[PDB]
């Protein structure tokens, strides 16, 4: 599924992301925008370590979720990666929340650092009523 902007904003809000560990809804939106274009089915294979990034947040299969085919895999979110490919993003949100409890917080995502940090992110929530 590809979310509409305000549809996704309301959904993330409903799942408790707005202000989670001090991270604004606006920044979570920018993350989803620049990881996957709001697309739950997004996948990116990394031939370098045979890992795959999954779902709207492009969560990687080496550390976070189990896809059964990534060598040296840890499953820190304790989730099947397939769970991160579903229309309902509840599981993806919980895993994203786990990611940011690590010291880097939302900086864990290099696309966020390059596309969001230090840039306008108000545009992602403007007009949504969230």
């Amino acid at each position: 599924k590809v979310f509409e902007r305000c549809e996704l904003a309301r959904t993330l809000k409903r799942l408790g992301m707005d202000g989670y560990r001090g991270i604004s809804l606006a920044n979570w939106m920018c993350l989803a925008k620049w990881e996957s274009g709001y697309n739950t089915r997004a996948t990116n294979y990394n031939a370098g370590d045979r890992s795959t990034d999954y779902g709207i947040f492009q969560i990687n299969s080496r550390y976070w979720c189990n896809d059964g085919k990534t060598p040296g895999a840890v499953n820190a979110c304790h989730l099947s990666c397939s769970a991160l490919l579903q229309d309902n993003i509840a599981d993806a949100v919980a895993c994203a929340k786990r990611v940011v409890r690590d010291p880097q917080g939302i900086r864990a995502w290099v696309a966020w650092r390059n596309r969001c940090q230090n840039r306008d992110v108000r545009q992602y929530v403007q007009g949504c009523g969230v």
């Epitope: 309301r10 809000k13 409903r14 408790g16 992301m17 707005d18 202000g19 989670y20 560990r21 001090g22 991270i23 604004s24 809804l25 606006a26 920044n27 917080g105 939302i106 992110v121 969230v130």
Partner: nanobody, 126 residues
């Protein structure tokens, strides 16, 4: 919990400025804000800032004139109030959250906040 301590405030003439600061102790904050209670008006969110990413919200009436910022090193948040006008006269209150916003809860809603400062008087005259 979270103890909030406000500093700054006072009297100033229109066009002038004041800097308010609020320092949090206790649980770590997710959001810190200034509210204000103007005379003969209902209380109101003025500006808010997310502790983790520094994202700010501003009330329409202070956009471009007020700047909210922070130094997490000192668990300290600042409100730089520029181009002050008589109608900015009010009691300003620091507020803080330790968790996320519930659905239906907006940054400017006092109910969204669980911790409050004691209030700081700001008087702007023509």
């Amino acid at each position: 919990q979270v103890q909030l301590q406000e500093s700054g405030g006072g009297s100033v003439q229109a066009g002038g400025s004041l800097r308010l600061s609020c320092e949090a102790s206790g649980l770590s904050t997710t959001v810190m804000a200034w509210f204000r209670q103007a005379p003969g008006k209902e209380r109101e969110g003025v500006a808010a800032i997310y502790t983790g990413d520094g994202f700010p919200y501003y009330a329409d009436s202070v956009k471009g004139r007020f700047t909210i910022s922070q130094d997490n090193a000192k668990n300290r948040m600042y409100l730089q109030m520029n181009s002050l006008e008589p109608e900015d006269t009010a009691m300003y209150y620091c507020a803080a959250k330790t968790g996320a916003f519930s659905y239906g809860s907006l940054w400017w809603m006092s109910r969204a906040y669980n911790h409050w400062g004691q209030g700081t008087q700001v008087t702007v005259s023509s």
